[PDB]
Amino acid sequence: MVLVLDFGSQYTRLIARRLRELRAFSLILPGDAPLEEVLKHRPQALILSGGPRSVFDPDAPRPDPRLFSSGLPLLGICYGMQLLAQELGGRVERAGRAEYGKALLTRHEGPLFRGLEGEVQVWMSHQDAVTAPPPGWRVVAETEENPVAAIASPDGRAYGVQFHPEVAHTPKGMQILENFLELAGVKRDWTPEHVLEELLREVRERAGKDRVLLAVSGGVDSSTLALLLAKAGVDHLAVFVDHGLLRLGEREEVEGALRALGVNLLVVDAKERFLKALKGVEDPEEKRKIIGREFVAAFSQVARERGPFRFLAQGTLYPDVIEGGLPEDLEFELLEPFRLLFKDEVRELALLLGLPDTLRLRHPFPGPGLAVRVLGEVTEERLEILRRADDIFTSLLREWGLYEKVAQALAVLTPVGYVLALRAVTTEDFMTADWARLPLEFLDEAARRITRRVPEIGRVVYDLTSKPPATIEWE
């Protein structure tokens, strides 16, 4: 268990994910947290993230002084390296500006850097500088502008880096993090079989003879949660609400696979209800309000009729922890087996649970579905048009091997006569995303087939906007 002490860096979650990609469990904890707190979990190592403020800024978070006196192997990143320096007898001074930049390490030596030969580009932090490492420590790295890009204690237990190894701009950062783990002798217990073993155990003990209620959307999160309950053999009822806003053929694909795998599934046909409720509504916020409201209604009705249900399982993920509404009279005990996992780790568990690639590798799709993909009132005719265009887009992407090369793809119908907007992005965290640069020949093919097979569509465009400044969905 490696502890990530968060000092505000926008890459903190990233640090935690990289550790797991190196088969080490990672947990995040605010930087300024009592020593008893950071230790109560038995950290095998510690990592001090960076932060947007200078170590000179009084508002900037400070760790527990005792922290540096625990004997725990530790790595300091940017702000973290500077904290480590001044807090131990080294000298840090103001310099540069709070910004990043690519830089080549003109010197990189010692165990922290093995495997890294040739050019070693790093994503340097330009805010301040340690000009003197703690007395007795070694400067194991430099760039042209900074004679001290990394430091290490004489016993090889603590290290500091003036750059971000968890970021893509430091292509060899993973190896550096891997060297650190190897150095701190961190056990690599974070494997999928280990996770599965634990979750089944837990879910069985907790659920007991009782029955679990769960909502299923088609997404891989809830699907894997369903498979978990079934495989664990706990009594449960998975509820799939067909709001009639799903992609072409989605309901059948989902119901067929989950049932074949053994989940007690109940499909609710609420298409008419949702469409009715959505009549004349353009405001995307209102659409979501209405969708959320119709959904909690049909779901509660099911819970009551098929009840009682002692537990309500949810697919809460670690990102949710680190930051609809059921009727008050409906009381449930929460079962959240994935609360310490990242989305991709659940996709891995799905593999061990027997979920087929058809569903295990599909892209995320929103709760309000196609309703947020028609700019304007949602009508049955508009959905029929968007469903068709969307289907053709997804199929071409799969045909040309491009589907697995984007994090998400979608089509948006814009009434004029219709203009269809194709949209695909690349992202890890869905919180910053770049427009996907699909081949021009592919875009031409997608546009010709759409206007060809869906004559109501008179023009096709491709969204060139990243996030920031724009959202992934158009509304």
Per partner kind, with CB cut-offs from 5 to 8 A, the member of ligand XMP, a copy of itself, none near residue 288 is: ligand XMP
Residues 283-342 that bind ligand XMP (CB under 6 A): 288
x/- map, 429-458, a copy of itself, by CB under 8 A: ------x-x--x--xx-xxx--x------x
Nearest Cα to 141, choosing from 100, 172, 99, 187? 172
The CA–CA distances, whole Å, from 446 to 283, 318, 397, 442 equal 29, 37, 9, 6
Q: Is 401 annotated as a binding residue?
A: no
* Residue 101 counted as an annotated binding residue: no
Closest CB to ligand XMP among residues 10, 106: 10
CB 151 within 8 A of CB 139: yes
For a copy of itself, the closer of residues 353 and 413 by Cβ is 413
Residue 220 known to bind ligand: yes
Q: Which of 317, 421, 433, 472 binds a copy of itself (CB under 8 A)?
A: 421
- Residue 463 binds: one of a copy of itself, ligand XMP, none (C-beta under 5 to 8 A by kind): a copy of itself
Q: Are 159 and 108 in contact (CB under 8 A)?
A: no
Kind and range of the H or E run holding 129: strand 129-132
d(CA 298, CA 43): 45
Whole-angstrom distance, CA of residue 206 vs CA of residue 334: 10
Residue nearest ligand XMP by beta-carbon distance? 471
Residue 113 has which token pair? 């850097």
| Cα–Cα distance measured from residue 385 to residue 423, given in angstroms and rounded to the nearest whole number | 17
Stretch 365-394 residues interacting with ligand XMP (CB under 6 A): 366-368
Per partner kind, with CB cut-offs from 5 to 8 A, the member of ligand XMP, a copy of itself, none near residue 60 is none
Q: Could you tell me which residues come within 8 angstroms of residue 407 by beta carbon, excluding any fewer than 6 positions away? A: 363, 364, 425, 426, 427, 428, 430, 433
For a copy of itself, the closer CB: 306 or 459:
459
Whether residue 125 is annotated as binding a ligand: the answer is no
Q: Of all helices (H) and strands (E), which one includes residue 285?
A: helix 284-306
Active-site residue set? 78, 164, 166
Restricted to residues 347-406, the positions that interact with a copy of itself (CB under 8 A) are: 375
Part in contact with a copy of itself (CB under 8 A); list of ranges 63-71, 358-366, 400-408, 462-470:
462-470
Q: Whose structure tokens read 């920031």?
A: 468
Is 300 known to sit in a ligand binding site? no
Residue 422 interacting entry, from ligand XMP, a copy of itself, none, C-beta within 5 to 8 Å by type:
a copy of itself
Query: For 350, how many CA atoms within 13 A lie in the half-sphere containing its CB?
Result: 27
Residue 219 marked as a ligand binder: yes
Q: How far is the CB of 462 from a copy of itself (least distance, A)?
A: 5
- Are the beta carbons of 166 and 2 closer than 8 angstroms? no
Strand positions, DSSP E, 137-250: 138-142, 150-152, 158-161, 211-216, 235-242
Q: Is 26 annotated as a binding residue?
A: no
Confirm or reject binding of residue 30 to ligand XMP (CB under 6 A).
no
Determine the residue type at 303.
Answer: A
Q: Which is nearer to a copy of itself, 307 or 439 (CB)?
A: 439
Judge contact between 403 and 357, C-beta under 8 A: no
Give the residues lining the site for ligand XMP (CB under 6 A). Answer: 288, 364, 366-368, 408, 430, 467, 471-473
Q: Which residues are annotated as a binding site?
A: 217-223
Give the residues lining the site for a copy of itself (CB under 8 A). Answer: 375, 414, 416, 419, 421-422, 435, 437, 440, 443-444, 446-448, 451, 458-466, 469-470, 474
Q: Which residues are annotated as a binding site for ATP?
A: 217-223
